[PDB]
């Protein structure tokens, strides 16, 4: 099998229009892609990366880029192709609504429970099909899913499938530097909540150093308003110390599944918040 098709670009068929964000692996440009010698232009997003452990990154990079140029998942963003200058750029279709961070915030009391509940299913369907290539996001957020369409989502980014933000991170990850499947769970926990807050800040206020103290004190994340118990029970499974405690994707694909099936029996949009 595998019969995927990297295209190696030449970087004179690429056009870098604007930045739309930049971070600890490289910066990410919206632009257009005119294939060599063709007459069509694609909206594409392009990430150039560093010059740094251009002898080791690469090749991790490279592996990346392999593992997703296959047409797996529709809710994983796949790999259009690679621009093998001195520094490596990957280029890449261009979701138009953006991150789904941004995209929650600005239509807050415009999305129903169902819209919610959709995306948690594909986030973890998503989720599902990278534990079955082996591969370890490390990074999960509502800032690294993107938005196709209104109902559509994709797993991206990838930079560290330290450096990541830890107010996303498994406990056994901030103390044993440790990254399982089960530490991407707990991160699939701290997304659905951000969703289910419309984009809230976790933990917000309290500064990074103080979150493993806080951690192993038994605090976590608290109840969204628009949450039932069901849902918020969920989370809180994602979030248990003990990594088999912690839910399967495959089982959390079909708890979300069933959820989406009856939105109206798991999560509330009536409840946006209250003013004291
Ligand atoms: C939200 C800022 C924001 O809206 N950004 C975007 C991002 C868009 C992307 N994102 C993207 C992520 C990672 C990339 O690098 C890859 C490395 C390896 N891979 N294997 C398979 N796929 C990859 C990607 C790249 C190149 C891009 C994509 C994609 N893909 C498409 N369209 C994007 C649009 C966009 O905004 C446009 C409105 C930040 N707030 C501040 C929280």
Same mark, same amino acid.
């Given at each position: 099998?595998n019969?995927a098709?990297?295209?190696?670009?030449?970087?004179?068929?690429?056009?870098?229009?604007?930045?739309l964000?930049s971070?600890?692996?490289?910066?990410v440009?919206?632009?257009?892609?005119?294939?060599?010698?063709?007459?069509?232009?694609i909206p594409?997003?392009?990430?150039?990366?560093?010059? =740094?452990?251009?002898?080791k990154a690469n090749k991790?990079?490279?592996?990346e880029?392999?593992?997703?140029?296959?047409?797996?998942?529709?809710?994983?963003?796949?790999?259009?192709?690679?621009?093998?200058?001195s520094?490596?750029?990957?280029?890449?279709?261009l979701?138009?609504?953006?991150?789904?961070?941004?995209?929650?915030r600005?239509?807050?009391?415009?999305?129903?429970?169902q819209?919610?509940?959709?995306w948690?299913?594909?986030?973890?369907?998503?989720? #599902?099909?990278?534990?079955?290539?082996?591969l370890?996001?490390?990074?999960?957020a509502?800032?690294?899913?993107?938005?196709? #369409?209104?109902?559509?989502?994709k797993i991206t980014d990838?930079?560290?499938?330290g450096?990541?933000?830890?107010?996303?991170?498994?406990?056994?990850?901030i103390?044993?530097?440790?990254?399982?499947?089960?530490?991407?769970?707990?991160?699939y926990?701290?997304?659905?909540?951000?969703?289910?807050?419309?984009g809230?800040?976790?933990?917000?206020?309290?500064?990074?150093r103080?979150?493993?103290?806080?951690?192993?004190?038994?605090?976590?994340?608290?109840?969204?308003?628009?949450?039932?118990?069901?849902?918020?029970?969920?989370?809180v499974?994602?979030?248990?110390?003990? #990594?088999?405690?912690?839910?399967?994707?495959?089982?959390?694909?079909?708890?979300?599944?069933?959820?989406?099936?009856?939105?109206?029996?798991?999560?509330?949009?009536? =409840?946006?918040?209250?003013?004291?």
């Amino acid at each position: 099998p595998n019969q995927a098709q990297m295209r190696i670009l030449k970087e004179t068929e690429l056009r870098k229009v604007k930045v739309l964000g930049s971070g600890a692996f490289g910066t990410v440009y919206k632009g257009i892609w005119i294939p060599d010698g063709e007459n069509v232009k694609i909206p594409v997003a392009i990430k150039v990366l560093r010059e =740094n452990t251009s002898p080791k990154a690469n090749k991790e990079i490279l592996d990346e880029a392999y593992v997703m140029a296959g047409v797996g998942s529709p809710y994983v963003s796949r790999l259009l192709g690679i621009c093998l200058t001195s520094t490596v750029q990957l280029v890449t279709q261009l979701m138009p609504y953006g991150c789904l961070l941004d995209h929650v915030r600005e239509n807050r009391g415009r999305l129903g429970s169902q819209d919610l509940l959709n995306w948690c299913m594909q986030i973890a369907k998503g989720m #599902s099909y990278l534990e079955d290539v082996r591969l370890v996001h490390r990074d999960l957020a509502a800032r690294n899913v993107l938005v196709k #369409s209104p109902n559509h989502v994709k797993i991206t980014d990838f930079g560290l499938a330290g450096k990541v933000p830890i107010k996303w991170m498994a406990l056994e990850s901030i103390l044993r530097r440790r990254f399982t499947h089960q530490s991407d769970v707990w991160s699939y926990g701290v997304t659905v909540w951000e969703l289910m807050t419309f984009g809230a800040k976790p933990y917000d206020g309290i500064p990074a150093r103080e979150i493993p103290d806080l951690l192993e004190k038994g605090e976590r994340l608290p109840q969204p308003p628009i949450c039932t118990i069901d849902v918020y029970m969920i989370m809180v499974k994602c979030w248990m110390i003990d #990594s088999e405690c912690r839910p399967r994707f495959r089982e959390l694909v079909s708890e979300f599944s069933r959820m989406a099936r009856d939105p109206q029996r798991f999560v509330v949009i009536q =409840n946006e918040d209250l003013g004291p």
